[PDB]
Amino acid sequence: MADEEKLPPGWEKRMSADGRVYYFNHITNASQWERPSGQGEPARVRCSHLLVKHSQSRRPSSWRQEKITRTKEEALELINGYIQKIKSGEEDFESLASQFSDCSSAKARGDLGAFSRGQMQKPFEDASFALRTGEMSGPVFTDSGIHIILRTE
Prior knowledge:
The chain is of the alpha+beta class. The protein has 3 helices and 7 strands, in the order ββββααβαββ. Strands 5-4-7-6 form a 4-stranded antiparallel sheet, sandwiched between helices. It has a 3-stranded antiparallel sheet with strand order 1-2-3, with no helix packed on it. It is classed as isomerase. The entry lists the keywords WW domain, beta-sheet, isomerase.
């Protein structure tokens, strides 16, 4: 913020397939055209998430499908679709989570409440603590499936 515009933790400058610089966070897997900026992590964060399970999930079943049979590839395709829909403005995170998340948290519009380190699967935890308030992750893979994470607090 002061006299410096170093990129925040996990952020790096990359070149898009179509020729424009963009920014990628290697911890949250988020990609955006906007420069992310221009100190330790938070002690606790509150996040909501949208989970898309697949046949190789630890528990290949959910409230919206007793037997999950989609491949991991298909799951990623859906995740990328939801991310694109949210970024476009045609859909909002909460609505999509309540309708399509394979996690029971869908009942709470994806809200998982607040948590500390050591309470969620590592990849999910790493992404969550690297997000700033209001930020959304890119595709995050865990033994549960593929997630889209939104930090609310």
